[PDB]
């Protein structure tokens, strides 16, 4: 696709042409609030007599479902100060930089981190540095330490004797998690090891079981041929703990402060949803939803899946 085609010949380095070595980078951590880790370059790259310096924003992740947000000021967003700013990769965040041998080269982020969520838009604009900001959400599980980079380089912008700075983002993901409570309805090996239950193609009504507790993450890799699903906007509670308002049907309605990731199932690559039960929620709740498939190619028999979600069933 044009959103993520990689140029295999592209080459660069962390320092670029600044001649600065890493021991002289101005290194600092991302500003982290809740589960959003933000690198904001809006005021870090303006030209100064001392320029160009290297501003390295370090994003260190060893927890699940962290959203990474990177803001790079736009050319002409302020007169003169960013006339020659460049960002790399141009197709961030779908394409990132990783170190191969000793240089930075382009890599598909979704191939690097299975289950990673790239939404098409940010603030109702394209998720691309051309609009000033990119975002992505790391998955509930990462098996291998992973390091990749973004460049927001204002070092070629000149204003009087002053030069802008070269901004680097280093995202350093340490391994975290093991397996998502839930089911994968079945490169392929990545799919088979990511969820606790693998539902291989069946021609009947078959049950997936997602057992969760306070603080747990669950998720589902939905079938390829999905037509319709009530997971998780139209849940049906069973077992009679409390009285049920039939309009309080989403997991949000039923579990205060629960979060569903990729509700719109509009993230690229991965036909997944993740759910997070908050640590505050201590009540017991058994829920049900369903997945219906398209009969595009008939097997003479229709496929459907029942998804059972039990919360705090202890």
């Amino acid at each position: 696709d044009e959103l993520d085609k990689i140029d295999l010949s592209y080459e660069t380095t962390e320092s670029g042409d600044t001649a600065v070595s890493e021991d002289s980078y101005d290194k600092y951590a991302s500003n982290n609030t809740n589960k959003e880790y933000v690198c904001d370059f809006t005021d870090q790259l303006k030209p100064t007599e001392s320029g160009p310096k290297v501003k390295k924003c370090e994003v260190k992740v060893n927890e699940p479902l962290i959203k990474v947000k990177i803001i790079c000021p736009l050319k002409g967003s302020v007169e003169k100060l960013y006339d020659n700013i460049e960002y790399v990769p141009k197709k961030s965040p779908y394409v990132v930089l990783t170190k191969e041998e000793t240089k930075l080269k382009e890599k598909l982020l979704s191939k690097l981190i299975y289950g990673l969520l790239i939404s098409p838009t940010v603030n109702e604009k394209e998720n691309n540095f051309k609009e000033g900001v990119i975002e992505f959400t790391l998955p509930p599980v990462v098996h291998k330490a992973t390091v990749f980079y973004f460049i927001c380089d204002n070092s070629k912008t000149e204003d009087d004797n002053k030069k802008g700075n070269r901004g680097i983002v280093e995202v350093y993901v340490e391994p975290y998690g093991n397996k998502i409570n839930g089911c994968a309805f079945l490169e392929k090996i990545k799919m088979k090891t990511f969820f606790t239950q693998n539902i291989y193609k069946k021609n009947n009504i078959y049950p997936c079981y997602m057992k969760l507790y306070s603080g747990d993450i669950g998720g589902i890799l939905f079938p390829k041929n999905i037509k319709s699903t009530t997971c998780f906007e139209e849940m049906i509670p069973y077992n009679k703990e409390i009285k049920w308002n039939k309009e309080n049907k989403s997991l949000g309605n039923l579990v205060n402060n629960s979060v569903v990731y990729n509700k719109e199932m509009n993230a690229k690559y991965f036909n997944v949803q993740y759910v997070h039960i908050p640590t505050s929620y201590k009540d017991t709740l058994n829920l049900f939803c369903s997945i219906i498939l398209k009969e595009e190619e008939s097997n003479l028999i229709s496929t459907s899946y029942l998804v059972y979600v039990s919360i705090n069933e202890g």
Epitope: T13, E14, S15, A19, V20, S21, E22, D23, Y25, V54, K99, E101, T102, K103, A145, V147, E170, Y172
Partner: single-chain antibody, 229 residues
């Protein structure tokens, strides 16, 4: 600043193994490549392999495949190189080095002497002249040719006897910090030059060019620049 300190000299019997350590202090360890280079006495520099510590796996020159293991201990910022089935020809000074965001190996250990006592499509670097005899204050011009196009991914190193290589120029023409301006580099593609505008006593040494376009990194056999008799 950044220091690489290696373990001390070793004497081994033929057929044995040796493990050399390289402790990095004052620089970031986990995300920058550590390389290992050896130099047989009186001979040139030879790339053996590299590791980016967070990856938990090294890369090796085919010449050493199956005899060399490169590892890194992140909690101590120490890299290791283990060479097995030692033979006489493995007698050499082994160097560790690291890159610092500019692709080139710009920080070097002091070297470890190891004494043994009882491929196709690689880029070939050709230096000339093999020897230069010049007087103080004269200009020196050194040449380096690559068998394949390497754009400007070429470095120049100065080595004094017994000492580790010292980076002078990287990206063909960029001076390393602290290097006097009488050193200059030129060229791109396959032909490169190092010029010393006016020779001073400190400038007499062996100079090596090195392509760092692609592994295995390869060195020219050096130009020995000595005082005119």
């Amino acid at each position: 600043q950044v220091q690489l300190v290696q373990s001390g000299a070793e004497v081994k019997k033929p057929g044995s193994s040796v493990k050399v350590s390289c402790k990095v202090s004052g620089g970031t360890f986990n995300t920058y490549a550590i390389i290992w280079v050896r130099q047989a006495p009186g001979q040139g520099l030879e790339w053996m392999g590299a590791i980016i510590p967070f990856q938990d796996r090294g890369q090796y020159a085919q010449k050493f495949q199956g005899r060399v293991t490169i590892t890194a201990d992140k909690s101590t910022s120490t890299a290791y190189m283990e060479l097995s089935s030692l033979r006489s020809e493995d007698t050499a000074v082994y160097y560790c080095a690291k890159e610092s965001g500019r692709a080139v190996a710009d920080r070097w250990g002091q070297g470890t002497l190891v004494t043994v006592s009882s491929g196709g499509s690689d880029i070939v670097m050709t230096q000339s002249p093999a020897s230069l005899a010049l007087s103080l204050g004269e200009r020196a011009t050194l040449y380096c040719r690559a068998s394949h196009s390497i754009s400007s991914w070429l470095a120049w190193y100065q080595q004094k006897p017994g000492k580790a290589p010292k980076l002078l120029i990287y990206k063909a023409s960029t001076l390393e910090s602290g290097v006097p301006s009488r050193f200059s580099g030129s060229g791109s593609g396959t032909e490169f030059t190092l010029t010393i505008s006016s020779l001073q006593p400190d400038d007499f040494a062996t100079y090596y060019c090195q392509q760092y376009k692609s592994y295995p990194w390869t060195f020219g056999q050096g130009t020995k620049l000595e005082i005119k008799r």
